[PDB]
Amino acid sequence: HNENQQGSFSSRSENINHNSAFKQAIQASHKKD
């Protein structure tokens, strides 16, 4: 399994800016003899 995610968002004088990200990489195995 692997994932990558990115997001960014933006909105007296007042202002807001935002970022987020995520990553995963996972591996599994089973063997039988």
UniProtKB/Swiss-Prot annotation:
**What domain of life does the native source organism fall in?**
Eukaryota
Describe how it is modified after translation. All cysteine residues are assumed to be cross-linked to one another. Individual modules containing an even number of conserved cysteine residues are supposed to have disulfide linkages only within the same module.
Question: Subcellular localization, per the record?
Answer: Secreted; Target cell membrane
Which disease annotation does the entry carry? Answer: Complement component 6 deficiency: A rare defect of the complement classical pathway associated with susceptibility to severe recurrent infections, predominantly by Neisseria gonorrhoeae or Neisseria meningitidis.
Q: Which family does it belong to?
A: Belongs to the complement C6/C7/C8/C9 family.
Subunit annotation: Component of the membrane attack complex (MAC), composed of complement C5b, C6, C7, C8A, C8B, C8G and multiple copies of the pore-forming subunit C9.
Q: What does this protein do?
A: Component of the membrane attack complex (MAC), a multiprotein complex activated by the complement cascade, which inserts into a target cell membrane and forms a pore, leading to target cell membrane rupture and cell lysis. The MAC is initiated by proteolytic cleavage of C5 into complement C5b in response to the classical, alternative, lectin and GZMK complement pathways. The complement pathways consist in a cascade of proteins that leads to phagocytosis and breakdown of pathogens and signaling that strengthens the adaptive immune system.
> What name does the UniProt record give this protein?
Complement component C6
Instruction: Please spell out the taxonomic lineage of the organism that makes this protein.
Output: Eukaryota, Metazoa, Chordata, Craniata, Vertebrata
Q: Tell me the part of the parent protein that is shown.
A: 263 to 310 of 934
